[model samples]
Target: TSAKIVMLGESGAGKSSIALRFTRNEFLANQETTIGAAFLSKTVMIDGRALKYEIWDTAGLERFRSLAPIYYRGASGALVVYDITNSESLKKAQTWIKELRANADPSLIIVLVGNKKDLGSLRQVSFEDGQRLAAEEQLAAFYEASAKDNNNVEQVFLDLAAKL
Candidate 1:
């Protein structure tokens, strides 16, 4: 089966890093901010079935917000990412969730992702915070990951593939 997956979040939330980690098994230490969106695909087998993910990594810049619906139109799942070091970005992620719920596919599988876990000293958002919000929003899943270190990066896609 094949599905479209979109990544959304505020600027600097590491959406691009997550995408790079998943699609290429690679990461850039100082990635250039995404302009509008980047697309990539990868195929993996789960439960003896092949799943192909067509990923849309959208820019988190405020100017590109209007382009989100276009990228997410037929998406089957999404990762609403936020920087663990920035509580405000989590709030923005919440808004993205609300917007997605209101305007995107009603059955869209959404995940709350707190990134930048490697920066422990800079952490601001607690894992509990993400957990509570995911529970309240009834999201498909929630996870903490660090794209820089490749921690839990594949797990996010694997969990979503399983759910899908």
Candidate 2:
């Protein structure tokens, strides 16, 4: 069986990178913004059980808000992504989280992701900030990952799939 996983965040927050990193184990340094939405699938093993994931990478532009509901419809899990180098990205991620909680399945498993962790020196959003918000917002999981460096990227999917 496969589970639908949705990615949400502001443009340039590395939403698509997260998807590509997980689905294809690849990353583009200058990945273009996702148009409407992109779909990818990958099956992973968790504790000897195979878990297939249907990843939906959505465009973060406000103009795409009308189409957001359809993308998240029937989603089993969601990743709220943010660029650690940009504080605004975290705020945008919060907005996505709120929207997901309101519109997605009540049992949807969600993870708060602080992407671009490799850019620690340029970080605008601290780990403490992510943790504090995750705790305050009642998120199921919180992780700081970097698609560029392949750091904790796979673990994010593994952890979420295990939860599902």
Candidate 3:
């Protein structure tokens, strides 16, 4: 099975980092902010089946928002990320979800992700906050991960792929 996915988040939410971690297994301490977008693909093995993902890593700057539909059109899934330390970032993510609802593929599987778990002790958005919204939004899954430490990053893609 194969599907297209898009990465959406605020400017510092680590969308590119997650894609890089999932596809290249590499992380940069000073990862540069992405502009416009990026195209990354990965194939995961679920049980005896192979699931392929073509991911569009979108830029988070507000100026780039207008081009989001160009990437998400016909996408099967989306990994909407927010920084755990930024309380309002989650709210911004919700807005993205609403925008997706209007013209998104009906079968789209959306995942709400809280990145920067390495700073959980300083988090402005608690785990419960994320879980509640995810369930309320009827998302495919919710994840708290740290791409820097390689924690739970791989499983994010795997679980999403399994659903697809």
Candidate 4:
């Protein structure tokens, strides 16, 4: 079965960057902000399983909040991300979670991720904090990752694919 994963977070949370890294393994120094949303696809063989995912990186602009329901339609999973160094992103992530929980598919598997782990000095969201929130939300899993370093990106998706 194909998996549809949506990425939700606040502006400047590096959601686009993370998606680019995972789906294309390429990075842009000055990537344009996501408009309404961007679709990325990746094919991976994990745990003797060939899995394909269509990842939607939704725009973080306030204007797009009302369109979330459209994006959540028929989605199988979601990756709610926040910048480890940006507390505001974490707050926005919470809001996204609330909306998804109430509106998305009942079997949607949500994963909470904290990105930009390489920015150790600026990290604001602690590891424990992400874990606690994921547990409280009953998410499938939680992880802190650094897309720039390609850390945990593959593992995150691989594990998610396995779980599904």
Candidate 5:
């Protein structure tokens, strides 16, 4: 099972962290060089069935916003990410979800992710908020994952693969 996926969220919302953790099984405490977007590829076997995902992590900056629709149109799924500590990030996630639903294919899988579980102490957006948003939007699933601690980072993709 191979599919193309997209990462959508506001900048500094840990999109690269999720991708980096999933692809390399590593994390950078301090984010280093990153620009408008990133492309990463990985294939994982869930009980022997291999699923390959080619992911496009588009930058959340306004200038890079124009590239989102281009990627969304071709993606089979999207990880609409939000930083758990920032409500503003969730707002962007909602915007992306809205645009995707309005413009992308109806069958495209949509998953809502609340990143930075490790930073739970700094939480601004509650878990229920993300969960309800996903449910309200009729997304496939919602998860609170920690790219820093490497928790459920892989499951986010693996679960999406099953629906893919």
Candidate 6:
């Protein structure tokens, strides 16, 4: 079976960065803004096992919010990302999480990811915020990541794959 993973987060929350890091291990300094959403696919081997993951990265700007449900249709897993330096973005992600929980597949494996951790000095949301939310929502995993720094980028995706 193929696994469909959706990346949901507020605009500029580094959703694409997380996906790019996992798929390509390369980061861009001046990435273009996501129009509505985009999809990327990657396959990996673990313990002599082969699996494929198709990831849909959704934009979190106000204009694109209405399209989330459509993108989440038939999704098996979701990685909800938020910018650690932006507290309001976390609330936005929370709203998306609520919507997905209410309407998406009941068995969806949701993973809470806090991106842009490299900007530690500008962080507005504490680690506790993500940790608490993940615990409250029974998320498969809660991750604080930095694609620029190559921190947990690969491990995060691998963990999600293993869980699925």
The CA lDDT of each predicted structure is 0.94, 0.89, 0.90, 0.85, 0.88, 0.87
Give the per-residue lDDT digits (tens) of candidate 4, residues 45-141: 8767677889988887888888767777878888888999988888888888888988887888888889999998999999998888888888898
Report the lDDT tens digits of candidate 6 across residue range 1-164. 56799999888888888888887776888877899688888898867888888999887778988888888988989999999998998888788789888989888998889999999799999999888888988889999999889898887888888888
Q: Order of candidates by lDDT, top first?
A: 1, 3, 2, 5, 6, 4
Single out the weakest 10-residue window by summed lDDT for candidate 3.
Answer: 43-52
Q: Name the best candidate (by lDDT).
A: 1
Instruction: Estimate, for each residue in 1-164, the C-alpha lDDT of model 5 and write its tens digit.
Output: 67899998888889888998998776888976356568899889977877788999888777788878877888899998999998898988999899998999999999999999888689999988888899999999899999999888988898898888
lDDT (Cα) of model 1: 0.94
Query: Model 4, stretches more than 4 Å misplaced?
Result: none
Q: Which stretches of model 5 miss by more than 4 angstroms?
A: none
Please estimate how well model 2 matches the true structure, expressed as its whole-model Cα lDDT: 0.89
Top model by TM-score, which number?
A: 1
Q: What are the per-residue Cα lDDT tens digits for candidate 2 across 14-111?
A: 98998998889889998987887999999988888788999999998888878988988889899999999999988988888888888888999999
lDDT per residue for candidate 1 within 107-127, as digits (tens), equals: 899999999999989999999
Provide the global lDDT of candidate 3 against the true structure.
0.90
Compare candidates 4 and 5 on TM-score and give the better one.
4
Clashes of 4: 0
Task: Choose 3 or 5, whichever is better by lDDT.
Answer: 3
Query: In model 5, where is the ten-residue run with the lowest total lDDT?
Result: 29-38
Candidate 6: C-alpha RMSD after superposition: 1.2
TM-score against native, each model: 0.98, 0.97, 0.96, 0.95, 0.95, 0.95
